[PDB]
Structure 1
Amino acid sequence: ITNLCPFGEVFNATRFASVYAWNRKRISNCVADYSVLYNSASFSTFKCYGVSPTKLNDLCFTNVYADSFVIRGDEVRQIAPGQTGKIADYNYKLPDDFTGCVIAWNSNNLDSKVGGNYNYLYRLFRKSNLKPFERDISTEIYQAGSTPCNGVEGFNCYFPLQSYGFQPTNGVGYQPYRVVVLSFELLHAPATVCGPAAA
């Protein structure tokens, strides 16, 4: 079935994950019009690393993954190789050798309420940085000192997750952005994900 990749299911999903609990959808055995995404005009960020966005329709890949989550506008810059900060270190980390596109759009109209949207969380604390594409959904109380923690919150013993408050009248830097990260894998196996214009 040489039929269109279900990119609609990723980009137009009703629900998006919290960044700490970021979704990964495997895409295979389908034809993908990357140009319609790139030329869309809904997106505020579209950055392709190790591949030109205008040649995507001409390439085939072994596997495509679509990772998706919500962050604040001024965190979108952290979804890039080499970056540091709460998001890049403790929630979602790209490898230094990343091949793929980082795509984002303002989602203020979907992910802010009147009185503010409190449904989204991010990991604030961790013992070390995530490895590329690592996911940590643990709620173990974080031990910031020598003193053991025993699952109990105290003066150096922190709950590791905090809530985004998405206020609708805030500045764009504080607004929610939906993000999709496409990773392109080219291995020694049959290439199952192709543009319309590829062999």
Structure 2
Amino acid sequence: CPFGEVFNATKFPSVYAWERKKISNCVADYSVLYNSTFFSTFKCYGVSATKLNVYADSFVVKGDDVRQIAPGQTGVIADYNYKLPDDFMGCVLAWNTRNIDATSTGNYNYKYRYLRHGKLRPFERDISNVPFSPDGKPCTPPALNCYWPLNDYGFYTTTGIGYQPYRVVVLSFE
């Protein structure tokens, strides 16, 4: 029911600081999304039937980064921002949002993590903004070998499709 609140929402978060919305009891039918070429991914990792009757994760990533919201899966986004368990699963949906999340001029609102001492456990979250040093040291930039672990995506309207912004909504089943 409160799906319009979820992926119809004006404001979507960064990947690293993703949001989780708790949905229980509410009666859904799924047809709200089932029949629509509004979406660009819609690949499930569990089922795809309808039994009238749950967690919703929202965030924005680059075109080429959608691949990474799946069991297994490569790096950066999957490694430091949003990890999905090898087993246990539900469904993943995505849509191109160039129209909203890109200014011709550049939209650097959205961030993501590229550096962390250690990969994430699934469904874990890291909101920590500490200057990173590959030897676990304290760090006082712009000193050499100091890095801020967060990178601005930078969404220009004109880039390749793989570089345009996509909103993502992960539906987990419990």
- Partner of residue 130, structure 1: 120
- Secondary structure of residue in 1 paired with 2:32: helix
Cα distance between partner residues in 2 of 1:165 and 1:150: 26
Q: CA RMSD in A?
A: 1.4
- Partner of residue 180, structure 1: 169
- Partner of residue 38, structure 1: 34
Query: Given the two structures, how large is their TM-score scaled by the length of structure 2?
Result: 0.95
1:87 pairs, out of 67, 74, 77, with 77
2:103 pairs, out of 91, 109, 113, with 113
One-letter identity of the residue aligned with 1:109: N
- Partner of residue 192, structure 1: none
Q: Structure 1 regions of 5+ residues with no counterpart?
A: 186-199
> What CA deviation, in whole Å up to 9, does each residue of 1:172-199 have, x standing for no partner?
10000000000002xxxxxxxxxxxxxx
- Secondary structure of residue in 1 paired with 2:170: strand
Task: Report the alpha carbon displacement of residue 36 of structure 1 after superposing the two structures with TM.
Answer: 2.9
- Which residues in structure 2 correspond to 1:10-159 (within 5 Å)? 10-51=6-47, 53=48, 55=49, 57-58=50-51, 60=53, 64-145=54-135, 148-159=137-148
Which portions of structure 1, spanning 4 or more consecutive aligned residues, are displaced by more than 3 angstroms? Answer: 150-153
- Partner of residue 161, structure 1: 150
Task: Report the alpha carbon displacement of residue 145 of structure 1 after superposing the two structures with TM.
Answer: 2.7
Q: Structure 2 regions of 5+ residues with no counterpart?
A: none
Query: Given the two structures, how large is their TM-score scaled by the length of structure 1?
Result: 0.83
Query: Counting strand residues as a fraction of each chain, which structure ranks higher?
Result: 1
Structure having the higher Rg: 1
Contact kept? 2:132, 2:139, Cα under 8 Å: no
Contact kept? 2:28, 2:52, Cα under 8 Å: no
